[PDB]
């Protein structure tokens, strides 16, 4: 409007609908659909199955962290001097404990997420928040004062961030095209494509 007399923006009729018009005459899709593996892992029906399918990721991350710390300890120890102690006995707890703690935290998160979703019966943000909060509570069992408040918050926030930018964002902005005519405005006289642009072939790596 760019005036001071009437409200800015506009209004669209709710009664009047515009019949959908295809973006192009022929649509070629270079985006592959989700794999059967993805759907299997995503299935939260059985909490135990869901947990056991998704823990490998947490275990791997714990193993990488433990390997990192163990290597740092091993690198410093001197080869030239003989050591009374056994290095593996010193280093094995590091890796084992890190992997176990990571797996336990990821198990708690996955279990609570599946159990809440089943009990509630709906896929919602709350399920992620309560799983994160429970994981952060387990993380901060014996930590000083600030940490009990901070970790349940950071952990609860992480599934919120994942849901907003991993699931809601793409579905929200699926229609936008970028070529031909703007999604909403097809009356405007813009070049109309016979086929959609294919910027890349479907990936295979």
Partner 1 sequence: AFVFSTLPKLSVLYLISNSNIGSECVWWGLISLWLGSISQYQSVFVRSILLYSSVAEIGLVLLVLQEGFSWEAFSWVSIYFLSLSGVWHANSKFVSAISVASIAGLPPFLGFIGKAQILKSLVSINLGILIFSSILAATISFIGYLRLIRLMYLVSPVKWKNNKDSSFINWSTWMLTVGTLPMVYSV
Partner 2 sequence: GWEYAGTYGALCGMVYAIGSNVISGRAWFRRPWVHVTSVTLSYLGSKLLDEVQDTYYLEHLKRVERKGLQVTEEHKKLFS
Partner 3 sequence: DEPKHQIPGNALDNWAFLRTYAKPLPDMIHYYYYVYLFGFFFVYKVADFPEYSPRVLVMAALIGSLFYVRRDWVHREFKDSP
Ligand X SMILES: CCCCCCCCCCCCCCCCCC(=O)OC[C@H](COP(=O)([O-])OCC(O)COP(=O)([O-])OC[C@@H](COC(=O)CCCCCCCCCCCCCCCCC)OC(=O)CCCCCCCCCCCCCCCCC)OC(=O)CCCCCCCCCCCCCCCCC
Ligand Y SMILES: CCCCCCCCCCCCCCCCCCCC(=O)O[C@H](COC(=O)CCCCCCCCCCCCCC)COP(=O)(O)OCCN
Question: Rounded to the nearest whole angstrom, what is the least distance from the CB of residue 184 to ligand X in the complex?
Answer: 29
Q: What whole-number distance in Å separates Cα of residue 131 and Cα of residue 118?
A: 13
3-state class of 103 per DSSP? Answer: helix
**Does residue 189 bind partner 2 (CB under 8 A)?**
yes
Question: Rounded to the nearest whole angstrom, what is the least distance from the CB of residue 59 to partner 1 in the complex?
Answer: 17
3-state class of 26 per DSSP? Answer: strand
Residue 151 in tokens:
């970790």
Question: C-alpha distances in angstroms, 124 versus 7, 80, 98, 101, 198?
Answer: 36, 59, 31, 27, 35
**Does residue 59 bind ligand X (CB under 6 A)?**
no
**Does residue 116 bind partner 3 (CB under 8 A)?**
no
Q: Which of 30, 68, 93, 182 binds partner 3 (CB under 8 A)?
A: 68
What ranges in 21-86 are assigned the alpha helix state H? 36-42, 47-76
Q: What whole-number distance in Å separates Cα of residue 6 and Cα of residue 70?
A: 68
Q: Which of 176, 189, 191, 194 binds partner 1 (CB under 8 A)?
A: 176
Residues with Cβ within 8 Å of 1's Cβ and at least 6 positions away in sequence, in order, are: 7, 8, 9
Which of ligand Y, ligand X, partner 1, none sits in contact with 141, Cβ below 5 to 8 A by type? none
Residue located via tokens 């869901």: 50
**Site mask for ligand X (CB under 6 A), range 124-163, x = bound:** --------------------------x---x---------
**Site mask for partner 3 (CB under 8 A), range 38-57, x = bound:** x--xx----------xx--x
Binding interface with partner 1 (CB under 8 A): 161-162, 164-166, 168-170, 173-174, 176, 178, 199-201, 203, 205
Binding interface with ligand X (CB under 6 A): 61, 64-65, 67-68, 71, 150, 154
């Amino acid at each position: 409007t760019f005036n001071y007399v009437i409200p800015y923006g506009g209004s669209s009729s709710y009664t009047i609908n515009n019949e959908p018009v295809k973006a192009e005459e022929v649509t070629v899709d270079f985006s592959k659909e989700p794999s059967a593996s993805s759907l299997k892992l995503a299935d939260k029906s059985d909490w135990i199955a869901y947990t056991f399918n998704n823990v490998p990721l947490m275990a791997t991350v714990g193993l990488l962290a433990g390997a990192h710390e163990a290597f740092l300890h091993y690198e410093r120890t001197p080869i030239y001097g003989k050591r009374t102690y056994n290095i593996i006995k010193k280093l094995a707890p590091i890796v084992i404990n890190k992997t176990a703690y990571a797996t336990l935290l990821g198990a708690i998160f996955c279990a609570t997420d599946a159990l809440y979703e089943n009990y509630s019966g709906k896929k919602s943000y709350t399920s992620g928040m309560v799983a994160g909060a429970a994981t952060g509570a387990v993380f901060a069992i014996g930590r000083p004062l600030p940490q009990p408040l901070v970790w349940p918050l950071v952990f609860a926030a992480a599934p919120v961030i994942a849901d907003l930018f991993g699931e809601v964002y793409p579905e929200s902005m699926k229609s936008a095209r970028g070529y031909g005519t703007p999604y909403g405005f097809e009356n405007l006289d813009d070049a109309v494509p016979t086929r959609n642009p294919i910027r890349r072939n479907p990936h295979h790596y």
